[PDB]
Amino acid sequence: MNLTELKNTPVSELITLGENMGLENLARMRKQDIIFAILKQHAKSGEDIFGDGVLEILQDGFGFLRSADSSYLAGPDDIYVSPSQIRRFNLRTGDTISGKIRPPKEGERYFALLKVNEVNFDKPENNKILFENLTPLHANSRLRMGSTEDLTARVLDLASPIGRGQRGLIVAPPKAGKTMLLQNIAQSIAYNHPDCVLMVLLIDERPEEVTEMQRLVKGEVVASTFDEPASRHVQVAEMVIEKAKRLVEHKKDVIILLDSITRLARAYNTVVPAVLTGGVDANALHRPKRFFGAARNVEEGGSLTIIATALIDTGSKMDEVIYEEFKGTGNMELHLSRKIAEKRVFPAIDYNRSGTRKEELLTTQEELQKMWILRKIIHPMGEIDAMEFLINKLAMTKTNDDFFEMMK
Numbered sequence: 269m270n271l272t273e274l275k276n277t278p279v280s281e282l283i284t285l286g287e288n289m290g291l292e293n294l295a296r297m298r299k300q301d302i303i304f305a306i307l308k309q310h311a312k313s314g315e316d317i318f319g320d321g322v323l324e325i326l327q328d329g330f331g332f333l334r335s336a337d338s339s340y341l342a343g344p345d346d347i348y349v350s351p352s353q354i355r356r357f358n359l360r361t362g363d364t365i366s367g368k369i370r371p372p373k374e375g376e377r378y379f380a381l382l383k384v385n386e387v388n389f390d391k392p393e394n395n396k397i398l399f400e401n402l403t404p405l406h407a408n409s410r411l412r413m414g415s416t417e418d419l420t421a422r423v424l425d426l427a428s429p430i431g432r433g434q435r436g437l438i439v440a441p442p443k444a445g446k447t448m449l450l451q452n453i454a455q456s457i458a459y460n461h462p463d464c465v466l467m468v469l470l471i472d473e474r475p476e477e478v479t480e481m482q483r484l485v486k487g488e489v490v491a492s493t494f495d496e497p498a499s500r501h502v503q504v505a506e507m508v509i510e511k512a513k514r515l516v517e518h519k520k521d522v523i524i525l526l527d528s529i530t531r532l533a534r535a536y537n538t539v540v541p542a543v544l545t546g547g548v549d550a551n552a553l554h555r556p557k558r559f560f561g562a563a564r565n566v567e568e569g570g571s572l573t574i575i576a577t578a579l580i581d582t583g584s585k586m587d588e589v590i591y592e593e594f595k596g597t598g599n600m601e602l603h604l605s606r607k608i609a610e611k612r613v614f615p616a617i618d619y620n621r622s623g624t625r626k627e628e629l630l631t632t633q634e635e636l637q638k639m640w641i642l643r644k645i646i647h648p649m650g651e652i653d654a655m656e657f658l659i660n661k662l663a664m665t666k667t668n669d670d671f672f673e674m675m676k
């Protein structure tokens with residue numbers, strides 16, 4: 269009846285509730301392999317099979333529909349779309365095509381697309397692409413974040429005020445709390461602004477840390493693992509950013525929580541050839557600069573906001589040079605010191621140097637004069653002790669009267 273079901277359903281409910289259709293031996297069949305053998309048996313005799321996925325136009329002329337569940341990996345369970353179907357409808361990589369599918373004829377090998385119900389959560393009626401929309405400022409609306417899973421969200425709203433559509437960069441050494449900071453920020457998105465679309469992207473990630481991430485975040489989670497080829501990392505990032513573009517064309521506010529822009533740039537460097545000072549090829553950091561460069565604040569309606577992690581102190585010469593490039597391109601900085609976290613103080617934020625560009629119109633009027641002086645009294649603090657001056661007064665009330673009573 270549906271494809272959105274079979275791809276996500278338990279892996280063993282296919283040999284229990286699908287084998288009873290009369291199949292030979294599903295001993296060593298991959299997840300997507302069996303789903304193909306079930307659809308190519310359910311549809312053969314009078315049915316109404318639905319189908320959905322995200323479009324990826326290849327190079328020749330056609331483009332398949334890929335599963336967001338499989339991190340956009342390609343298998344037998346992909347819906348084929350004819351070049352002629354990319355003609356009548358103005359199709360661009362990143363479109364969510366939902367419609368009635370059909371079994372292969374004789375030699376097609378890929379389930380083809382027939383009827384097209386909704387193109388990007390809407391009937392085929394087309395508008396203004398991202399490359400045409402004006403880009404005035406990151407600051408229009410703000411996304412603000414005495415419990416426990418709010419104490420790190422508290423210093424986030426004080427150090428680096430996030431905006432509804434903003435280029436964000438988190439600079440953190442390994443083991444400072446970055447892979448756990450994203451699952452902290454993502455939590456406070458569906459707990460404050462559930463209207464926003466959420467996509468978490470993890471490039472060159474650890475397998476067991478992917479599962480922890482997807483079973484904790486309220487939204488879409490796509491990732492690549494450190495065993496997958498350099499070309500694979502490119503695809504997932506090329507799929508997420510192109511899809512998020514299609515939604516922003518539809519006035520929708522999208523947020524991307526990218527992890528490892530360095531490991532993403534390290535991927536592009538490996539694929540894009542052709543002049544390499546510091547390990548990285550000079551004419552290669554163009555592609556990852558474009559990814560991060562898309563995060564804007566559309567005037568015509570919409571919001572693209574990427575907050576990516578720029579890894580430092582990896583030891584590798586390459587990862588060091590990648591940050592040197594992005595240093596100031598983003599208009600939001602959130603540092604994590606590997607000395608505050610060293611002494612088991614884990615909200616390890618270098619508050620002193622974590623400001624945002626043009627934060628004057630990102631907040632309420634009566635908020636700046638206190639925020640600056642609140643830092644002017646934290647300027648001569650330091651490292652470990654600095655995160656003890658703004659954690660004790662923070663442990664009391666919410667955010668407002670945090671510095672009201674105690675001001676001797």
Ligand SMILES: Nc1ncnc2c1ncn2[C@@H]1O[C@H](COP(=O)(O)OP(=O)(O)OP(O)(O)=S)[C@@H](O)[C@H]1O
Nearest residue numbers: 420441442443444445446447448449452609614615
């Ligand atoms: N918000 C937080 N609250 C409490 N503890 C935290 C927080 N963030 C990080 N930590 C602690 O700091 C450690 C950091 O581990 P992770 O959550 O994996 O972060 P990480 O810096 O990305 O680690 P790596 O470099 O990927 S192995 C964990 O053992 C946590 O106990």
Ligand SMILES: [Mg+2]
Nearest residue numbers: 446447474477
């Ligand atoms: Mg990690």
